[PDB]
Amino acid sequence: FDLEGYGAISRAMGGTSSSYYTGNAALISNPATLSFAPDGNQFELGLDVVTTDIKVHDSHGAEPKSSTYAVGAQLSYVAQLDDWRFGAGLFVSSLGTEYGSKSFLSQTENGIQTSFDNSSRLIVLRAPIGFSYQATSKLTFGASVDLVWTSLNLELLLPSSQVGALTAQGNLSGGLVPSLAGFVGTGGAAHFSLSRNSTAGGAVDAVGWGGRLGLTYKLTDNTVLGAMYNFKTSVGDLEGKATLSAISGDGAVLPLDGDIRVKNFEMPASLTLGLAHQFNERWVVAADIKRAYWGDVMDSMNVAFISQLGGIDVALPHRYQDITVASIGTAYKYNNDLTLRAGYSYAQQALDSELILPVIPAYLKRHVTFGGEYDFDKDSRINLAISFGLRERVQTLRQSHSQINAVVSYSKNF
């Protein structure tokens, strides 16, 4: 879901990654770039805090606001040995909405203000084991594999009409649907809740695996070429405790308690390629094109709620498409220890969608990165980064939202 950049310096140059040293976050990016590290053993610690700013406005002007900040982190050690760089890491990141329980999105049809809450929070934990061999002096090659652990927590309200659209498109089923239609009726609402790791398991979480591999060529003595393939993150089944709760035309509430199993939530596979010409030996420039490939694997994400009274089920086809994100970045060393970086990264999806789901914000296209490094030891470096998600006005409801992302790292060398 870090479709964009990964690393404090990769984040600082428009998410570029493939054909230059991006720190140890290249494990999550292109492990073939790790052999461009200084000698010995780089040990990195990164911190990222992300403030999001969604403003859904609706049919006849009512403001639902989400001004939440998610934070992710990073810590990794890549050790030299021969050409072989052998590192590993823990990469946590976070994303979420929290609109509260006073919005129009906390209304039934009719318009009855319920107490229910709209909110979401995902936490992925990539954790790669990776390598980087220098083959010839012109070619390096790396690969990693990550253990992954996702945790999803959700508070979602659907006005009756949306439920009806779901059964009508052949998407909803399950024996609770009859049963509880006619408690919810044409002015009611259904609600789902998935609450924090209070239960040891539960939580709604899964384990799985992801993969990576890459390369690099020095076409000039001052121009590098780079390619890497990220795999579809094969997330296991999300499982935990949920509460489906049915609300009626007057505001009555039927709380129900069962287990949800979310099948087939894929992160996408992706193929990026790029260069980094250095035409001045303190004025570097890099650029990649990434294409993220969803449009493959033609199955369906299945949300199954089972309970003592019966099951509800939602099948959402995997549909989907590419996102092509052209990104460029520069890195002028104006002096010995201080490189200064900037960039931009326009993404554009192929066949679009306008699934205005306020609890699922969509990736912003035009980001604008900035940042730089200060070596204050040459064996103890530090990097920072700031990225502006230039905002969209999407319109089905009508949304507006923007991201500011802000990173740092510390790399002490050994």
Residue numbers in the entry: 4 to 399, 409 to 426
What text does the study give?
Thus far, only the FadL OM channel family has been shown to mediate transport of hydrophobics. PpF1 has three FadL orthologs, of which TodX (Pput_2883) and CymD (Pput_2901) are located in the adjacent tod and cym/cmt operons respectively. Here we show, by using an integrated approach combining growth assays, X-ray crystallography and molecular dynamics (MD) simulations, that MAH uptake as the first step in biodegradation does occur via lateral diffusion. In the presence of TodX/CymD, robust growth is observed, providing the first direct evidence for MAH transport by FadL-type channels.
The lateral opening in TodX involves both β-strand S2 and S3, contrasting with EcFadL in which only strand S3 is involved. Strand S2 in TodX bulges outward, whereas S3 has a less pronounced kink in the same place as EcFadL. To flatten the S2 bulge, we removed seven residues that were not visible in the density of TodX, replaced a proline with alanine and inserted an alanine to connect the strands (ΔS2). To flatten the S3 kink in the ΔS2 mutant, we removed the conserved glycine residue G104 to give ΔS2S3. We determined the X-ray crystal structures of both TodX variants which showed that, as expected, the size of the lateral opening is drastically reduced as a result of the flattening of the strands, while the remainder of the mutant structures are very similar to those of wild type. The two TodX mutant channels ΔS2 and ΔS2S3 have much smaller lateral openings, while retaining overall high structural similarity to the wild-type protein. Plate growth assays with vapour-phase toluene showed background growth for the TodX and CymD lateral opening mutants, indicating that they are defective in toluene uptake. For TodX, background growth is already observed for the ΔS2 mutant, so the effect of the additional flattening of strand S3 in the ΔS2S3 variant cannot be assessed.
